[PDB]
């Protein structure tokens, strides 16, 4: 193999890392194999793939299982103080499997979020364009775009013999001069692997947020009119009628700001306000009674949309920042071996956060479906 020299040989070589990080990879392995296997068993065998979201959720669990197969290799690798005994062929597959799963899992969530924007906001107009054939062709393109993105992890990932410590490792060699590796390889994982997809994931669920808000606020406006109309019928003085009629005029304007006679209702409420203000109590109740039910509603859907976005953001944002810090060292913006140590120490920590939350994504998205939750609890019971 090749014999190279490490600029900062003591960077990232800490005993608490060589003991804790392999333990974390074991926790991710057992939980990941357990959770992602049940997702495949429930979807592919108990539901037979009947929707577009089921195709994405199936491939989201299959992609995580492929990454978990290479996880025991990295566990014993970090356990032996970064020593690679599996050869040069097994590293190119392992390093590609991690890069492949990063792009694939994030691309699937991007398309799954776009599917939710169309299924909730445009149910009738986007149904003929969202079929089973489209979901399968979308996934095979995602497999190609992820494999194309993990392509440098197959070409430039070689096994090197470090002469400083006589330790055989596999890595990218950020040569100071005459390097065949691309300059900004970590930049691709930033924009293509996080920045661009997150802005689509954030935009999709924000439009779902705004659509459900206009629909829920409209129902509360109608519920305000009906509840206040019953207050006027049960009122006994002009003060109670004045309070309910003012709340109905305000609710009519909010319901109008969601071509017809909304000004007719608002004008007739304003006519009733002219009677209740002049001490007339019985006359205002007659005009209110002359003017003027079981829809599903989940007021906790906004907490769900909030959790979905922040779970994708806070899980990847530790790994994507130190990835960007790795690029600054590669370009030559920073050459200090002190900041290279805090980057080499925090990289195993961020991977244990991003890839642990990512292996629980097919399980969390499954529990949102009421039918999926039914089959999942039957297997455990």
């Amino acid at each position, epitope marked *: 193999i090749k014999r190279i020299q490490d600029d900062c040989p003591k960077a990232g070589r800490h005993n608490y890392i060589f003991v804790m990080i392999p333990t974390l990879y074991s926790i991710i392995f057992v939980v990941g194999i357990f959770g992602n296997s049940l997702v495949v068993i429930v979807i592919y065998f108990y*539901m037979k793939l*009947k929707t577009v*979201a089921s195709v994405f959720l199936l491939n989201l669990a299959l992609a995580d299982l492929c990454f978990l197969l290479t996880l025991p290799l990295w566990a014993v690798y970090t356990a032996m103080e970064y020593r690679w005994p599996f050869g040069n062929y097994l590293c190119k597959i392992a390093s590609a499997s991690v890069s492949f799963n990063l792009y694939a899992s994030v691309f699937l969530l991007t398309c799954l979020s776009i599917d939710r924007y169309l299924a909730i906001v445009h*149910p009738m*107009k986007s149904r*003929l364009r969202r079929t089973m054939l489209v979901a399968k062709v979308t996934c095979i393109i995602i497999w190609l775009l992820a494999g194309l993105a993990s392509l440098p992890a197959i070409i430039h990932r070689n096994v090197f013999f470090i002469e400083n410590t006589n330790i055989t490792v596999c890595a990218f060699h950020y040569e100071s001069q005459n390097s065949t590796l691309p300059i900004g390889l970590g930049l691709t994982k930033n924009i293509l692997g996080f920045l661009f997809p997150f802005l689509i994931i954030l935009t999709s669920y924000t439009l779902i947020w705004k659509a459900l808000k206009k629909a829920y606020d409209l129902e509360d406006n109608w519920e305000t009119l009906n509840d206040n109309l019953k207050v006027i019928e049960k009122a006994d003085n002009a003060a109670q009628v004045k309070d309910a009629l003012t709340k109905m005029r305000a609710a009519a304007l909010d319901a109008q700001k969601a071509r017809h006679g909304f000004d007719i209702l608002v004008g007739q409420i304003d006519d009733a306000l002219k009677l209740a203000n002049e001490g007339k109590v019985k006359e205002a109740q007659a005009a209110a009674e002359q003017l003027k039910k079981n829809k*599903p509603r989940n007021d906790d859907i906004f907490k769900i949309i909030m959790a979905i976005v922040l779970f994708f953001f806070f899980s990847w944002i530790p790994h994507q920042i130190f990835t960007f810090l790795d690029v600054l060292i590669q370009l030559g913006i920073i050459r200090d071996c002190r900041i290279a140590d805090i980057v080499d120490t925090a990289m195993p920590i961020t991977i244990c956060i991003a890839y642990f939350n990512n292996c629980l994504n097919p399980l969390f998205y499954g529990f949102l*479906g009421k039918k999926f939750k039914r089959y999942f609890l039957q297997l455990l019971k």
Partner: nanobody
Amino acid sequence: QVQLQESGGGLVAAGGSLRLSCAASGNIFDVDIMGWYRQAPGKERELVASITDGGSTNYADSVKGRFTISRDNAKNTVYLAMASLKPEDTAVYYCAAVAYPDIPTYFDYDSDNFYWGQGTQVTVSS
């Protein structure tokens, strides 16, 4: 399951009139949005009209001004009043509806909260 029963189809001469009906059954809560789809022979399916629980309607450009869709939220039924029928309108008309369960998480890996009907034939001779 939320089933959809259709009725009103038949063979009529060119320029006649029909009224397609579709009532939703098997639902505990009100159906959200209902519409009509048709599939001409040898061509892909297309959306004809759709009406929401609020009353907003959306028609296609080929049936605009001729068809009139309506619904009765009490019985969860949708009526498609077809007038000035053309020989191009000869197709099988399908009824579609969107219905969410109680406390809807707006996710469904079984039916996507979307339900179809059997379909009724509508033929128009020139």
